[PDB]
Design a binder for these strands. Structure first.
Ligand SMILES: [K+]
Ligand SMILES: [K+]
Ligand SMILES: [K+]
Ligand SMILES: [K+]
Ligand SMILES: [K+]
Ligand SMILES: [K+]
Ligand SMILES: [K+]
Ligand SMILES: [K+]
Ligand SMILES: [K+]
Ligand SMILES: [K+]
Ligand SMILES: [K+]
Ligand SMILES: [Mg+2]
Ligand SMILES: [Mg+2]
Ligand SMILES: [Mg+2]
Ligand SMILES: [Mg+2]
Ligand SMILES: [Mg+2]
Ligand SMILES: [Mg+2]
Ligand SMILES: [Mg+2]
Ligand SMILES: [Mg+2]
Ligand SMILES: [Mg+2]
Ligand SMILES: [Mg+2]
Ligand SMILES: [Mg+2]
Ligand SMILES: [Mg+2]
Ligand SMILES: [Mg+2]
Ligand SMILES: [Mg+2]
Ligand SMILES: [Mg+2]
Ligand SMILES: [Mg+2]
Ligand SMILES: [Mg+2]
Ligand SMILES: [Mg+2]
Ligand SMILES: [Mg+2]
Ligand SMILES: [Mg+2]
Ligand SMILES: [Mg+2]
Ligand SMILES: [Mg+2]
Ligand SMILES: [Mg+2]
Ligand SMILES: [Mg+2]
Ligand SMILES: [Mg+2]
Ligand SMILES: [Mg+2]
Ligand SMILES: [Mg+2]
Ligand SMILES: [Mg+2]
Ligand SMILES: [Mg+2]
Ligand SMILES: [Mg+2]
Ligand SMILES: [Mg+2]
Ligand SMILES: [Mg+2]
Ligand SMILES: [Mg+2]
Ligand SMILES: [Mg+2]
Ligand SMILES: [Mg+2]
Ligand SMILES: [Mg+2]
Ligand SMILES: [Mg+2]
Ligand SMILES: [Mg+2]
Ligand SMILES: [Mg+2]
Ligand SMILES: [Mg+2]
Ligand SMILES: [Mg+2]
Ligand SMILES: [Mg+2]
Ligand SMILES: [Mg+2]
Ligand SMILES: [Mg+2]
Ligand SMILES: [Mg+2]
Ligand SMILES: [Mg+2]
Ligand SMILES: [Mg+2]
Ligand SMILES: [Mg+2]
Ligand SMILES: [Mg+2]
Ligand SMILES: [Mg+2]
Ligand SMILES: [Mg+2]
Ligand code: NA
Ligand code: NA
Ligand code: NA
Ligand code: NA
Lengths: 141, 64, 114, 156
RNA sequence: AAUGGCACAAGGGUGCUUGACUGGGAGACAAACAAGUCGCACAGGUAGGAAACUAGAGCAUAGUGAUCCGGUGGUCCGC
RNA sequence: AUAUCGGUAGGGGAGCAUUCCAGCGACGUAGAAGGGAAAAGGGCGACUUUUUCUGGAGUUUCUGGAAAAGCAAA
RNA sequence: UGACCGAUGGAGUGAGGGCAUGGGUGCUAAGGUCCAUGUCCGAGAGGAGAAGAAUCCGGACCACCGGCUAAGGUCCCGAAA
RNA sequence: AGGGUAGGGGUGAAAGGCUAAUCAACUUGGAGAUAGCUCGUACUCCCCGAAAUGCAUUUAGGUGCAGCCUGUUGGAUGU
RNA sequence: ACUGGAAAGUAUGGCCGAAGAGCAUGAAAGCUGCGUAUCCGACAUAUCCCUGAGUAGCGCGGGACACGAAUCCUGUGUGAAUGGCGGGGCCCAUCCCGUAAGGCUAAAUACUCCCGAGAGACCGAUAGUGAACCAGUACCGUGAGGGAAAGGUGAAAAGAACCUCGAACAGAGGAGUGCAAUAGACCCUGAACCCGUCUGCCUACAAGCGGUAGGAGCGCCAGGUGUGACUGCGUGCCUUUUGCAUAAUGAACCUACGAGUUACUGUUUGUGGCAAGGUUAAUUGUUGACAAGGAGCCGAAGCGAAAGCGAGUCUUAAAAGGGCGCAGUCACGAGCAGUAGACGCGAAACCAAGUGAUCU
RNA sequence: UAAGGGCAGACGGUGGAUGCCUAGGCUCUCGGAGGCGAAGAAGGACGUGAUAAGCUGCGAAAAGCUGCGGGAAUCGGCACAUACGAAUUGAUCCGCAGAUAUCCGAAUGGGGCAACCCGUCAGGCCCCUGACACAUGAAUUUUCAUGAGCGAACGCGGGGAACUGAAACAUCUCAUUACCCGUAGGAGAAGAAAACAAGUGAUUCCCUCAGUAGUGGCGAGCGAACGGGGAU
């Protein structure tokens, strides 16, 4: 093609909807609005959370809980991912192949079966047991 | 401008892993005694938002 | 950019005004009166295309009745005899023969007048 | 309506005049009134992914190469700006009949001045190649160093 | 109150008692939503009884009404 | 192949015309646009072609793009 | 038959009415009023009843100067004894 | 003839009279106030096609959610 | 050379190009004019030991801070210290940070009455500024104030000597100019509503939305066209309604004008690019384009109010006894939503600053 | 018989649609500049031409006067004009610098119904004239500089609504908005820790953090900062 025979992909573009332009279009007259009432007027909007005067659900259910402003959240890395990284080094925590300046926690999802030297901020008990069974090392910092 | 979150909704609702909305149970009568000890149904277990009432809590929490 | 379709807008009216020729008074040339008259005529034309078949069948039946009563029979008796003898000549052909080919109509009548 | 120059005074009283009820003079129903939903100043820029744009550039270059409208000439310099010299080069390369795009590796002030006045010719650096500029011209003339620059910069 | 039930009584007496329990809800009824109704299994330890068994209040259906903000008794987070 | 195809509110699909833009093709004082008359055409339609008179200088096809993008009643 | 059910995008409606049946109310009145079960008008053209929203027959893709029927009809206006 | 009292302010031998043909003032601006109300809403062809009920409501000619329509889908059962 | 009133048009054939931007010229010009690329040019005139007292702090009443009672401010009443004092969200202690009651300070930021150079998938005379022209004019009002309509002969005025009718150019018919005067001053083009003349056919026994379907005769230019005796059927349209010929609403008619738009943020979907990853924002370089910018955002683990544990977790003394869990991302187009006047016209009113006692 | 009427065609009238055209608007970009005025402003009045001036220009020296530089044949402004003159001894025109510049207006000698009336003192002419001076407030020492008024937006400061939303309404919102008033500069304001925080290191602005922390008849709503990346 060139600039004189441009073509988009089939179904990529579509004409917009135009209302109030006659009977043949199927969208004239009342222009998809119905007949009367509040919803047919210019400038109508929905009051969000308004149910006609009944007590709304966000007011009749109770508030619960509190959030911790000093919350430590780790990033879950599993043993199967650790194996995948190990298969094309031994000393792990390279993190350049994945997080970006965060705390990491090793969890037990697959298996290791290979001697690693995994270093991470925190570990699971099953993770440490699996590393020991595979004949590896755990460094926690 | 960006859509604003409803403050009461953000204090009353939470999201789960599958995208379901969980909530606390309001009592029928909040004066315990003269109500059967089976009030653990509304006193111990978090429930979910009914599918019919859904999309309203979503719009309250900015369709999240 | 600013788009106004002056020529197309006027041509649409002029085409319909060409069809409203011959009407009475304002109905021939005054746009909102002429357009109103034209569409009612179109509904009339739709109904009249249906009623034309009824009218022409009634005319054929009346002419056949006259010719058969000349021959000494009524329309209903002649049609009963024709259907019993199983000939498939339709009312338009029978009326055309009755008005223009009386010898052929006489032949048809004599075949079934047994 | 809010930026017309007429006053906001009600033109006629609400009831009793016998005509249509009227507000202020800036109404769109009145001759010389407001322009409803007219144009507003706009920014028409939109975003395409970098990989999408690179793929489009490669697609345009491949279209040219497949349709056999790419020819490679030696690098040349002009001692003085000479439109006749550039025209002679174009006629020798047989790209004077239609639109042609030259791809150069460097500035080449004299060459640019020589090519400035010719109708169906365009000049562009190799590192500034874009899909529209490639597709706009019938023929594409690369130089020896332009081939190397395009190969090293727009590869993969 | 009315309706339905009730003799192996769910009606009336004595004796002993605290199950007017803790942790609970396979499964259903009903229902715009909010609310509502019946009911586990098993474990801990009891009451009655020779045992079997029964007891998570009352023959059943009315006897209240959210959220927010406050009070009281127990038991994780703030600077 | 069979079946189906009345429709208000309303949902869905496919298109015509208008103004400007890019690319590619064209037309015009041997007569452009506009105005009058006539003729033909379209699964169907919005509309499109052709001839002639007036007119006396601009217009148009195809593909894609963008909207001050269509009136009978307030 | 085919559209029943799930999940999702978009709605409109939330003034109904007539007839038949079972009832309440009224006066065993109302083209009255309030419910239930069907149906039609609403949103439905065509035929008969002189002329009638919902009574009887019947659901209109377009064309035809072809044929058969439904309700109801066949002395003339007006098709057919 | 000249002067003074200015907006619910003045003035009123009191009628809520008069205050520039305006009185339970005028001009400009906030301002395109608000109007759950009335009216109006423009090219074409094709396919499908309702509701006028329930619950709640300072609600009753408004609205929320169900019920009934439509588009795309995945299961299958609906009559 | 051709056409033309007139070539810049067409067709040949040449030439310049650091100049093929443009405007004008009797039609559309690289080579006719002014210009353009490029180079050159200014007599002046401008511009470049000491250490902040009615202080810190405090009581009462208020205010600003995102905050509707920690920090900062103060109307009222009080009132120190010289390592001390202040702050880290009520209050105390430890710790950490800082050094009030004195002052000045460029850059990166906001805006356009004005001057200069440019641009537009902006308008083209009911549009675009109210104002293309005599425009804040005419007109209206005591006043503050409100506030229009109105562009186009022709290339060139060559803007019609003279004649005829007529009292007169009032107007016209000629002559003449001109490509054209049916371009003649209101002058390009010259539509509709509305108003006439001529020609053809019909019409004075006939009765309802004015058409529609049949159908003689007459009349024109070879199968088309005008009219139409006579026959059948037919209570306009919009809106609003359970239901409208309705005696419910609405319009004198024509031409022109007139009402779901745009921005941002979500969400769903059609089509695409990458893919366990996806994508840059502000901004920065080289010349709108290429290249750089990884800050940030989503995804990649969940459960629990939380500490926390983790393909588990919560409840429990303990139990699956119960609850919740065991391919994305970035765009382009389209639907919908919210926030902005948000489909258009329409109140009665409320508030602020002014103008009026020339009437009464 | 058509008095009249109906339909069609042709040709006219009226009217000014449409098409084509236009420097008159609209929105911006880049670079400058960001004031004028008591040495009298903005804005006006009255004049000024060979022929009345409606605009334009100018000011009793009045479509104009002088010098220097540029330049070379027409010129004497425009609303469809003739006359009469100027000009190669260099007009007209363009750039820079000068001269003149009536009256009102902050208006400033005193008044006043703006564009007018009435004065005093020093001189000069000659009851009347032309030319001087004669205001007020603040630094100031009666000598001196400065100020007053006007004017686009942007800045800072002093006062400060209501309609509206919350489906009523009073806390709340609209909004420290509209509006009134005062006062700068080319920008203004801010700015060098009795700071944030749980190591950074003065202000200002942009992108994020984030519709998050908070706040709120915990309703409608409102809504940061730390940190990170930049401009400087
Ligand atoms: K008992
Ligand atoms: K009858
Ligand atoms: K008959
Ligand atoms: K030229
Ligand atoms: K002409
Ligand atoms: K012309
Ligand atoms: K005419
Ligand atoms: K007729
Ligand atoms: K009426
Ligand atoms: K008086
Ligand atoms: K400063
Ligand atoms: Mg519809
Ligand atoms: Mg309509
Ligand atoms: Mg309506
Ligand atoms: Mg209604
Ligand atoms: Mg509605
Ligand atoms: Mg409104
Ligand atoms: Mg009309
Ligand atoms: Mg106003
Ligand atoms: Mg306008
Ligand atoms: Mg529009
Ligand atoms: Mg339930
Ligand atoms: Mg059908
Ligand atoms: Mg249909
Ligand atoms: Mg011609
Ligand atoms: Mg055009
Ligand atoms: Mg197109
Ligand atoms: Mg329009
Ligand atoms: Mg129109
Ligand atoms: Mg209702
Ligand atoms: Mg109802
Ligand atoms: Mg009734
Ligand atoms: Mg009855
Ligand atoms: Mg209806
Ligand atoms: Mg029906
Ligand atoms: Mg019928
Ligand atoms: Mg039969
Ligand atoms: Mg009274
Ligand atoms: Mg009066
Ligand atoms: Mg407002
Ligand atoms: Mg209004
Ligand atoms: Mg159907
Ligand atoms: Mg609904
Ligand atoms: Mg010739
Ligand atoms: Mg011409
Ligand atoms: Mg105008
Ligand atoms: Mg006379
Ligand atoms: Mg002519
Ligand atoms: Mg004309
Ligand atoms: Mg008679
Ligand atoms: Mg007769
Ligand atoms: Mg009624
Ligand atoms: Mg009727
Ligand atoms: Mg009405
Ligand atoms: Mg009327
Ligand atoms: Mg009517
Ligand atoms: Mg009208
Ligand atoms: Mg005419
Ligand atoms: Mg003098
Ligand atoms: Mg000189
Ligand atoms: Mg004075
Ligand atoms: Mg309110
Ligand atoms: Na559609
Ligand atoms: Na009074
Ligand atoms: Na006549
Ligand atoms: Na004076």
């Amino acid at each position: 093609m060139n600039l004189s025979s441009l073509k988009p992909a089939e179904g990529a573009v579509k004409s917009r909807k135009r209302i109030g332009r006659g009977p043949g279009s199927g969208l004239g007259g009342t222009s998809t609005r119905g007949h009367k009432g509040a919803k047919s007027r210019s400038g109508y909007s929905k009051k969000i959370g308004f149910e006609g005067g009944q007590m709304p659900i966000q007011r009749r259910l109770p508030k619960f809980g509190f959030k911790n402003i000093n919350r430590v959240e780790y990033k879950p890395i599993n043993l199967s991912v650790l194996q995948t990284l190990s298969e094309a080094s031994v000393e792990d925590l390279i993190a350049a192949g994945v997080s970006r300046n965060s705390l990491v926690k090793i969890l037990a999802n697959g298996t290791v079966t290979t001697a690693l030297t995994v270093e991470a901020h925190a570990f699971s008990k099953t993770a440490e047991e699996a590393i020991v069974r595979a004949g590896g090392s755990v460094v926690k910092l | 401008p960006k859509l604003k979150t409803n403050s009461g909704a953000k204090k009353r609702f939470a999201l789960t892993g599958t995208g379901k909305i969980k909530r606390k149970h309001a009592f029928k009568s909040h004066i315990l005694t003269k109500k059967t000890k089976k009030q653990k149904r509304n006193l111990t277990y978090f429930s979910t938002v009914h599918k019919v009432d859904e999309n309203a809590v979503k719009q309250l929490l900015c369709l999240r | 950019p600013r788009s106004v379709n002056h020529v197309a807008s006027r041509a649409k009216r002029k085409r319909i005004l060409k069809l409203t020729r011959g009407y009475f008074g304002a109905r021939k040339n005054v746009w909102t009166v002429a357009k109103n008259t034209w569409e009612k005529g179109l509904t009339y034309a739709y109904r009249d295309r249906k009623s034309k078949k009824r009218n022409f069948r009634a005319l054929w039946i009346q002419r056949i009745n006259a010719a058969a009563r000349l021959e000494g029979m009524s329309y209903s008796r002649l049609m009963g005899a024709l259907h019993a003898n199983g000939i498939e000549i339709n009312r338009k052909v029978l009326a055309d023969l009755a008005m223009n080919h009386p010898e052929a109509f006489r032949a048809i009548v004599a075949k079934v007048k047994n | 309506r809010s930026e017309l120059s007429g006053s906001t005074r009600k033109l006629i009283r609400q009831k009793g005049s016998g005509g249509a009820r009227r507000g202020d003079i800036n109404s769109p129903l009145l001759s010389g009134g407001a322009r409803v939903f007219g144009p507003r100043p706009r920014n028409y820029s939109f975003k395409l992914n970098k990989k999408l744009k690179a793929l489009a550039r490669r697609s345009a270059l491949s279209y040219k190469a497949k349709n056999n409208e790419i020819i490679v000439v030696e690098d040349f310099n002009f001692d003085a700006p000479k439109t006749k010299a550039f025209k002679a080069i174009s006629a020798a390369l047989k790209v004077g009949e239609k639109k042609v795009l030259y791809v150069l590796p460097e500035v080449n002030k004299n060459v640019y001045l020589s090519a400035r006045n010719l109708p169906n010719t365009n000049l562009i650096l190799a590192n500034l190649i874009n899909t529209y500029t490639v597709l706009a011209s019938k023929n594409l003339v690369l130089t020896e160093r332009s081939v190397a620059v395009v190969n090293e910069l727009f590869k993969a």
